[PDB]
Amino acid sequence: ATQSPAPWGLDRIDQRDLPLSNSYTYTATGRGVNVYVIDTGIRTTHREFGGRARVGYDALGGNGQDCNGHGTHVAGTIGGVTYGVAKAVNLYAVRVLDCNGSGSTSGVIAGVDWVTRNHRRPAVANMSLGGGVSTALDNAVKNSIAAGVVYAVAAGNDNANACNYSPARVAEALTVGATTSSDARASFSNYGSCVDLFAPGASIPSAWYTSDTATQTLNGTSMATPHVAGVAALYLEQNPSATPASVASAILNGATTGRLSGIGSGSPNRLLYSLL
Ligand SMILES: [Ca+2]
Numbered sequence: 001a002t003q004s005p006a007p008w009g010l011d012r013i014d015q016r017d018l019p020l021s022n023s024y025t026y027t028a029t030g031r032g033v034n035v036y037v038i039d040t041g042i043r044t045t046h047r048e049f050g051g052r053a054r055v056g057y058d059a060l061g062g063n064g065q066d067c068n069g070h071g072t073h074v075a076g077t078i079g080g081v082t083y084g085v086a087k088a089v090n091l092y093a094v095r096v097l098d099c100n101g102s103g104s105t106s107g108v109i110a111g112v113d114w115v116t117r118n119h120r121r122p123a124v125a126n127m128s129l130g131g132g133v134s135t136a137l138d139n140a141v142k143n144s145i146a147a148g149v150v151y152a153v154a155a156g157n158d159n160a161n162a163c164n165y166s167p168a169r170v171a172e173a174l175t176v177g178a179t180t181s182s183d184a185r186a187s188f189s190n191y192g193s194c195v196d197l198f199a200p201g202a203s204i205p206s207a208w209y210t211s212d213t214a215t216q217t218l219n220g221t222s223m224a225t226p227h228v229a230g231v232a233a234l235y236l237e238q239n240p241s242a243t244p245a246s247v248a249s250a251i252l253n254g255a256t257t258g259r260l261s262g263i264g265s266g267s268p269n270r271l272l273y274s275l276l
């Protein structure tokens with residue numbers, strides 16, 4: 001099916017080169033695959049989700065609904081009917097951050113462990129968050145991936161080496177940096193050898209929590225990451241038996257190479273491509 005016109009980030013990833021086509025083509029929808037958004041929650045009644053969003057877990061005593069905006073926004077780029085890569089996935093809120101988007105690492109780990117024990121295959125988890133080095137968080141994400149869940153995580157927005165952050169530095173997770181519509185590294189994006197690939201992450205429009213119709217445009221590696229989660233869901237729809245290692249390998253081998261500018265030392269020149 002082809003969506004036209006389309007949000008620029010969707011637009012960019014179904015082609016290798018500029019200029020943008022104002023169209024996003026998809027041969028899969030992620031139907032039947034379960035995406036766990038570990039974030040500030042999700043406004044599940046937002047019209048972008050058409051009943052496909054539900055709450056899985058809330059580490060803060062609440063009901064899993066978003067009161068910040070970020071989780072809803074992220075969920076929309078993954079699976080919203082207009083703003084989403086994979087327009088028919090199942091979305092699950094795993095709420096580990098408060099209305100101000102803050103939370104202890106302990107609560108983040110609680111949500112990662114919940115996904116490990118409660119996910120259903122095929123399963124994708126999105127972590128559009130990051131912080132200083134934490135071996136306990138790294139280990140909980142590695143254990144979740146060993147259990148069979150594909151993880152996409154933000155590289156971080158420090159304009160720094162991504163290996164210095166958790167869970168960005170986990171080798172087994174897909175670690176995602178941000179680019180602009182000119183195919184350059186966004187000026188805030190972390191980079192280097194712990195980054196696995198880049199995806200659109202500046203001026204990304206998606207859903208917001210303040211109403212069932214609200215939208216917002218945002219910048220960050222948190223916005224790049226859900227594009228990659230969405231593509232993992234596309235792949236798993238057609239290959240539901242694939243291990244996280246094989247999914248990562250399909251996306252990285254299929255990635256567009258050589259098109260990016262300013263990506264930094266040690267960074268791979270790889271841009272997400274959806275038509276795997
Ligand atoms: Ca396009």
Ligand SMILES: [Ca+2]
Binds near residue numbers: 168173174175195196
């Ligand atoms: Ca990684």
